């Protein structure tokens, strides 16, 4: 099989920076009709791929002219003249000359931006869920950068471990930030043993840790 | 434009058949490719069919497992995969000309499907920040992936964050979908989360109401 070697693995770029991605094939991609079937794709986080370039250099309809493709034989490059926030995602090359068709391993383009503190929100469990015998408490951190954030649960000031799960969004295609949820889950019986439920958030955008809290049954 | 069929739960050793409906280009003029996306987000070519004459070509790895067909009267392409195993759980895409389909998720498992419970994440003074309020829906205890979540029948998209599901210690999945809105708005606007889980044929609409606290 023809191996497509893509580099770099990751691009960490600021808005306005040029970027370039290299694709090297292990054999020539020149086909016997004289065309070189080398395509470039972008898969933004959460979406299907979209083709940007075909036949090495030909942009698809709607693709911004900031993108250019070049190369021949075995060495190919995708260049972005100045990166915009919506360019994030994973770029792939893929060759259509040989069987099997093969793809490069992907280059992840991530955007570097200024630090942005999270907005922090907390949700007590719903009465519907409590009636079923479980209490989930949710702490939400919205639109922050960088992605590292420390979220600690405290129940009547006791630090919790072992009862929560976190999930982080993909980087946002418009403001290049992340959001994160932390869900503390207890049985109703355990929930009812305690009064103060708090989530404490530490992040480089905050001058000191932020706590959001409620007393059980006040809501 | 390529529109693929919905997600599938299939038992180990059984088969799956998925479709890809084409519009807006000449279906019969381009190879129709099928591509598997691996967990690490690599892409792996399965094969193509050329709908102009029916010729297929395959990755040797999928020969004897994959069958590709194309109905030129309806501009629809089909892929069948037989003898499924755990390694066949993946998202599968069709691709042709400049277009890719949205992908079909196939989960290979013998476990029964289970629909989600949907609970409100109600806004309150504890979910306000700088004049905005957050609200959402907690979608809990379903199997397999995916659930889709829309807000107000797809009319509400700005500021929505539908988080990647987590795997619970039970083996069921859970996710939340949240939105940030003006806090001035909570008495007049209606926020309904629409949750669809195709494998269990579950559809839930839940109005999220504020708490008084």
């Amino acid at each position: 099989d023809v191996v497509m070697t893509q580099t770099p693995l990751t691009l960490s770029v600021t808005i306005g920076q040029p970027a370039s991605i290299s694709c090297k094939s292990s054999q020539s991609l020149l086909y016997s009709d004289g065309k070189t079937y080398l395509n470039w794709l972008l898969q933004r986080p959460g979406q299907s791929p979209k083709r940007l370039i075909s036949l090495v250099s030909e942009l698809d309809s709607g693709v911004p002219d900031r993108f250019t493709g070049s190369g021949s034989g075995t060495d190919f490059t995708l260049k972005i003249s100045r990166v915009e926030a919506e360019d994030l995602g994973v770029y792939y090359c893929w060759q259509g000359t040989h069987f099997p068709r093969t793809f490069g391993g992907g280059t992840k383009l991530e955007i570097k931006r200024t630090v942005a503190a999270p907005s922090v929100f907390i949700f007590p469990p719903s009465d519907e869920q409590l009636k079923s015998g479980t209490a989930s408490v949710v702490c939400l951190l919205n639109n922050f950068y960088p992605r590292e954030a420390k979220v600690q649960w405290k129940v009547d000031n006791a630090l919790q471990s072992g009862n929560s799960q976190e999930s982080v969004t993909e980087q946002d295609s418009k403001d290049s930030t992340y959001s994160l949820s932390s869900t503390l889950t207890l049985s109703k019986a355990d929930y009812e043993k305690h009064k103060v439920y708090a989530c404490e958030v530490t992040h480089q955008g905050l001058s000191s840790p932020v706590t959001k809290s409620f007393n059980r049954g006040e809501c | 434009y390529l529109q693929q069929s919905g997600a599938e739960l299939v038992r180990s050793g059984a088969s799956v058949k998925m479709s890809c409906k084409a519009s807006g280009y000449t279906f019969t003029s381009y190879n129709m490719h099928w591509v598997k996306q691996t967990p690490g987000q690599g892409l792996e070519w399965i094969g193509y069919i050329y709908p102009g004459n029916g010729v297929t070509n395959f990755n040797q790895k999928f020969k004897g497992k994959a069958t590709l067909t194309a109905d030129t009267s309806s501009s629809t392409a089909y892929m069948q995969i037989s003898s499924l195993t755990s390694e066949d759980s993946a998202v599968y895409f069709c691709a042709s000309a400049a277009y890719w389909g949205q992908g079909t998720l196939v989960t290979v498992s013998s476990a029964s499907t289970k629909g989600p419970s949907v609970f409100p994440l109600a806004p309150s003074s504890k979910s306000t920040s700088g004049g905005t309020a957050a609200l959402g829906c907690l979608v809990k205890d379903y199997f397999p992936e995916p659930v889709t979540v829309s807000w107000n029948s797809g009319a509400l998209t700005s500021g929505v964050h539908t988080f990647p599901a987590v795997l619970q210690s039970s083996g069921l999945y859970s996710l939340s979908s949240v939105v940030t809105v003006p806090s001035s708005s909570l008495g007049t606007q209606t926020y309904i989360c629409n949750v669809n889980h195709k494998p269990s044929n579950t559809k839930v609409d839940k109005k999220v109401e504020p708490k008084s606290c």
Binding site: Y31, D33, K35, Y37, N39, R51, S54, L55, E58, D60, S61, W94, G96, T97, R101 | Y25, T26, S29, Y30, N31, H33, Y48, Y50, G52, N53, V55, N57, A95, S96, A97, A98
Partner: peptide, 13 residues
């Protein structure tokens, strides 16, 4: 409307 380029060559008949 200029049709999109192929990703790869079509097979012969």
């Amino acid at each position: 409307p200029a049709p999109p380029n192929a990703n790869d060559p079509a097979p012969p008949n």
